[PDB]
Amino acid sequence: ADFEVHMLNKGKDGAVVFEPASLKVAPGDTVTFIPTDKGHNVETIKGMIPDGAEAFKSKINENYKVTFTAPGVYGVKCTPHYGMGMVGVVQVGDAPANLEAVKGAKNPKKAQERLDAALAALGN
Ligand SMILES: [Cu+2]
């Protein structure tokens, strides 16, 4: 299955957001990060990707389709807007096994707040 996430200067949750900021998918599903507004990208957050996955980083303004295979939680950021909290979580499967590893990863405050909210929205 294929899902879409919009990269926005602003949205429901305020300044510099992924919409949605949380997404539950199955192994092998894809997510396309869409540069609806200019100036954004998507990058994995260190400490927030499960065993068997590979970190990535898209180019600014790249329409970017990512396959999520290994189960668990994936934290993503927009590289320039990470400090400002432009972050999201993609969760592959239920009962993610890397949850406490990812909860311990270090993030700047606005990012941490939005990451915790996305984790809670996903049932964690
Ligand atoms: Cu951004």
Swiss-Prot record:
**Localization per Swiss-Prot or TrEMBL:** Periplasm
Binding residue positions for Cu cation: H40, C78, H81, M86
Cofactor notes: Binds 1 copper ion per subunit.
This protein's UniProt keywords: Copper, Electron transport, Metal-binding, Periplasm, Signal, Transport
What Gene Ontology terms describe where this protein resides (cellular component)?
periplasmic space
Q: Which cofactor does it need?
A: Cu cation
Domain of life, per lineage:
Bacteria
Q: Where is each Plastocyanin-like domain found?
A: 5-93
MF (Gene Ontology): copper ion binding; electron transfer activity
Functional note: This soluble electron transfer copper protein is required for the inactivation of copper-containing nitrite reductase in the presence of oxygen.
Name of the featured protein: Pseudoazurin
Query: Per the UniProt entry, what species is this protein from, by scientific name?
Result: Achromobacter cycloclastes
Source taxonomy lineage? Bacteria, Pseudomonadati, Pseudomonadota, Betaproteobacteria, Burkholderiales
* Gene behind this protein: bcp
